[PDB]
């Protein structure tokens, strides 16, 4: 086997330069696995392009590509509706979904596509399940579709993908976190040094309460090979990265006000605003209703 | 799950505020240390949920980030102790450390802020411990008594000049709050000096004895020592104050009179200031959200 070992293994990475190089050395072939990916890598690289307006799933990429700006999903609907579609068309499909907020149906779009796991994109879909159901905080949901899946079971370049998957299921669990989850998370981030395995690394020392660690990638990712240098993938990054400084703070007792706004005008449909805007809300409306 | 494995594991009002579970977290407050007014808690409120939570990217970027916790403890202890991380007494020393360096340099509004802020972090803490639970409760009177201090001596400075008995009791009264004997003595500094300036010379003679038992060297105890030996002369007060050193008594930190053992009081649950009888019902002084006199079952900090 082997074809897509380097393109998902860069994709998955954040590595997507270098992903969209392991994809040129294809000059002139395409199928849908490569057409999703290099779809995917030049959204992530911010240089999108229509790569086939032919095809089922390249209509499907455009309209998905569209809705992330027009936040519309009626066309991608309506042209999902009804008829036999693919993992990779259910994979846009349900992460338009779940950006909408609408969780519960987009977990039940992938659960659609996650029969047979020998066809083309099953894996990605489950992945996405996973994320899907750990977005709705339905940890046990998550938990019972990897396991079954896995154990009812490996290609060389899907293993990283389930690992993925496997991983963000322990990130929500705090399942050893300080053994193998951190280990994983540290050897990525060493391998395959991008924003998205030093954000990984982060997350899993705040987890583990070590400031100073933890503040040391922040410093890191300050620096000039990352904010200047990988000034591409630093944007697509940047919101998650204030969420993070924010916490990091918050556990050393220092003002974070600066940082949230920051975060708030970056990006404020952030996962951490949605979390803000509800407690302060909340507590409002407590001080309102005991006066 | 994480959050009702919280909740399951302690009632807290530091696990019910990084659960979610404001309501069940005031109303706990309400019970246990009298707390009525919620505002000044708000940003603590906000501080523990957001401590304990984090955010990795997903894949794509274009999904919601994913949610993950900070817990209290690593996977080595026991299934009934799986609690949020919420921070703890390193920072409330930090903040009264940011209060005494704002008391040595003069800036006591600021300093008041910053006791109040240890105040309102001892309020939702989570220790394991019986001997950080004692610390958090010293510490928790330390700041009230620096407040109290602090605002005899704020209010002592807004007075219009003719107010000159009630000034030289509020200089006096500043000298009865347990600061450290190092900050105690700003306030006799200022006692005795005021009171000498007023020839009140028994009153600066004791202020200034009470000065050199702590600081016996250098040019502020050699002012002390000439300013009592000149009020030791004298032997006279021109104007007579409130005021017993000797006596066992409070300052009501309201009207900042003296409570002593047969004066009707009331106290402040949370931070056990006291006040005068009148001042039953309304809320206290140090720390602005709980209510004088109330009944309350005692601060909850120990899992």
């Known amino acids: ?291 | 799950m994480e959050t009702a494995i919280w909740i399951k594991n302690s009632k807290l009002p530091a696990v019910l505020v990084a659960a979610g579970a404001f309501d069940a977290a005031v109303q706990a407050l309400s019970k246990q240390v009298g707390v009525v007014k919620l505002e000044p808690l708000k940003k603590y409120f906000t501080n523990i949920y957001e401590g304990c939570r984090t955010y990795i990217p997903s894949t794509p970027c274009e999904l919601p980030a994913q949610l993950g916790y900070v817990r209290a403890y690593d996977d080595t202890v026991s299934e009934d102790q799986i609690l949020p991380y919420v921070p703890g007494l390193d920072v409330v020393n930090e903040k009264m450390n940011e209060g005494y360096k704002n008391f040595k340099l003069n800036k006591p509004d600021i300093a008041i802020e910053c006791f109040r802020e240890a105040i309102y972090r001892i309020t939702l803490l989570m220790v394991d411990d019986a001997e950080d639970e004692k610390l958090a409760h010293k510490i928790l009177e330390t700041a009230r008594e620096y407040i109290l201090g602090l605002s005899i001596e704020l209010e002592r400075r807004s007075l219009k000049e003719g107010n000159t008995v009630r000034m030289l009791e509020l200089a006096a009264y500043f000298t009865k709050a347990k600061l450290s004997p190092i900050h105690r003595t700003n306030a006799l500094q200022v006692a005795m000096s005021q009171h000498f300036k007023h020839k009140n010379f028994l009153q600066a003679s004791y202020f200034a004895g009470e000065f050199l038992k702590i600081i016996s060297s250098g040019p502020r105890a050699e002012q002390a020592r000439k300013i009592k030996n000149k009020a030791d002369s004298m032997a006279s007060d021109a104007i007579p104050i409130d005021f017993d050193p000797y006596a066992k008594f409070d300052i009501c930190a309201a009207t900042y009179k003296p409570i002593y053992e047969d004066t009707p009081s009331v106290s402040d649950p949370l931070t056990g200031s006291k006040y005068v009888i009148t001042e039953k019902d309304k809320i206290d002084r140090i720390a602005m959200i709980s209510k004088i006199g109330a009944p309350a079952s005692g601060l909850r900090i120990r899992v």
């Open chain 1, 1 to 291: 086997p082997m074809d897509y070992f380097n393109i998902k293994q860069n994709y998955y990475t954040g590595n997507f330069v270098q992903c969209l190089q392991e994809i040129e050395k294809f000059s002139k072939v395409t199928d849908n696995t490569l057409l999703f990916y290099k779809a995917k890598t030049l959204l992530a690289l911010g240089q999108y392009q229509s790569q086939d307006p032919t095809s089922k799933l390249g209509k499907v990429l455009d309209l998905y590509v569209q809705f992330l700006d027009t936040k519309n999903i009626e066309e991608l609907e309506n042209l999902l509706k009804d008829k036999q579609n693919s993992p990779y068309e259910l994979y846009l499909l349900a992460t338009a979904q779940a950006i909408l907020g609408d969780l519960d149906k987009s977990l039940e779009t992938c659960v659609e596509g996650i029969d047979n796991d020998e066809a083309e994109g099953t894996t990605e879909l489950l992945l996405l399940a996973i994320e899907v159901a750990l977005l709705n905080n339905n940890v046990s949901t998550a938990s019972t579709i990897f396991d079954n899946y896995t154990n009812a079971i490996v290609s060389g370049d899907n293993e990283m993908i389930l690992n993925l998957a496997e991983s963000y299921i322990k990130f929500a669990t705090n399942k050893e976190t300080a053994t193998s989850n951190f280990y994983y998370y540290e050897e990525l981030s060493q391998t395959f040094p991008t924003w998205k395995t030093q954000l990984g690394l982060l997350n899993l020392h705040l987890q583990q309460r070590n400031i100073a660690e933890a503040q040391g990638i922040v410093e890191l990712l300050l620096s000039d090979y990352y904010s200047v240098e990988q000034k591409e993938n630093a944007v697509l990054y940047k919101p998650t990265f204030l969420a993070n400084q924010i916490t990091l703070a918050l556990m050393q007792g220092l003002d974070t006000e600066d940082l949230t706004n920051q975060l708030v005008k970056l990006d404020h449909e952030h996962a951490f605003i949605k979390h803000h805007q509800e407690i302060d809300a909340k507590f409002d409306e407590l001080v309102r209703k005991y006066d």
